[PDB]
Amino acid sequence: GNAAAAKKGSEQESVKEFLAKAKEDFLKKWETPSQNTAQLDQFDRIKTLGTGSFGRVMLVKHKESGNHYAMKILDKQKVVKLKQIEHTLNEKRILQAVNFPFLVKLEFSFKDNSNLYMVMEYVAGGEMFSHLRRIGRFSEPHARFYAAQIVLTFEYLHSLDLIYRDLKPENLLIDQQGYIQVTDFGFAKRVKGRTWTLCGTPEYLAPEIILSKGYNKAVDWWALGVLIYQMAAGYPPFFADQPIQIYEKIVSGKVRFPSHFSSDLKDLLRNLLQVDLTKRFGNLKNGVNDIKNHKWFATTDWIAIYQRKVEAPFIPKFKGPGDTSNFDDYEEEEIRVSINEKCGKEFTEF
């Protein structure tokens, strides 16, 4: 009212301060992305941490610093064959301009005649789609713990005019501290106003997207609704063996809530899974505050969550031992870059 109100105002003003600077740091790196901020001979190739149809992820150690990083290698030719050029260039650009705790960290970036390299911060943990399948279902307090980090992440990402059209368990990963870290921005897009492209997994598409009349940031909030639901239920709200059918369920908008769902959870979800974006929480007059201040989040210490000072509902197993059972079988071939540039034109911006 006096000191009490002034307390909030100051806190609010500092947040306004945090996003303001963050927005500036981002804009800089965004219209003038860093390039070839490292070289291949600066790293010590330890071992293969896995592969893909694009290239392979390799564990490496910086010769000067001693730090380890996850270096994913991408064969430009394969990337082009698979038609992931735009996707890849986009993700690398967002990743080098972005910066937030629950967002994956790109440490270095470069490319040569043969590949595109992304030296990622070494993270140790599993996927969140695997743990959900394992645990089966999360308790409301646990689901809240995650949803809370997601909320902050979109608050950040939204303040940047970025729309993450790809929320889903597969894109989320739990780290060694038990906190979330979003990994995948190929679909993300910087846009003020609305955009029309249809992308993202079916069970997560907001009504407006499938309705093809354009859509804005509000779809991530609807997606937060789908995630939360899936965590607390064990399965997604809208499902069908064929996409078209899932669309019908989404656009219709008739959800079925598990009976173990607390009233608050049922209430929050009703306002997040709002078919009418104009009445959807997060896309209203109080923005993210309608979400943060909801009853279901009443016990959430946003600042603490942000600072990872809340105890994770559990920490991933991989530290302490394993007995060979933790890992096994991977391709151990050498890296051979050409003497002739490949797909030089397509990846000029990288």
Curated annotation (Swiss-Prot):
It is an enzyme of class 2 (transferase). The modification Phosphotyrosine is found at residue 330. Residues 43-297 form the Protein kinase domain. Autophosphorylated; phosphorylation is enhanced by vitamin K(2). Phosphorylated on threonine and serine residues. Phosphorylation on Thr-197 is required for full activity. Phosphorylated at Tyr-330 by activated receptor tyrosine kinases EGFR and PDGFR; this increases catalytic efficiency. Pfam families: Pkinase (PF00069). Keywords: ATP-binding, cAMP, Cell membrane, Cell projection, Cilium, Cytoplasm, Cytoplasmic vesicle, Flagellum, Kinase, Lipoprotein, Membrane, Mitochondrion, Myristate, Nucleotide-binding, Nucleus, Phosphoprotein, Serine/threonine-protein kinase, Transferase. InterPro entries: AGC-kinase_C, Kinase-like_dom_sf, Prot_kinase_dom, Protein_kinase_ATP_BS, Ser/Thr_kinase_AS, STKc_PKA. One of its GO terms (biological process) is negative regulation of glycolytic process through fructose-6-phosphate. This is cAMP-dependent protein kinase catalytic subunit alpha. It comes from Mus musculus.
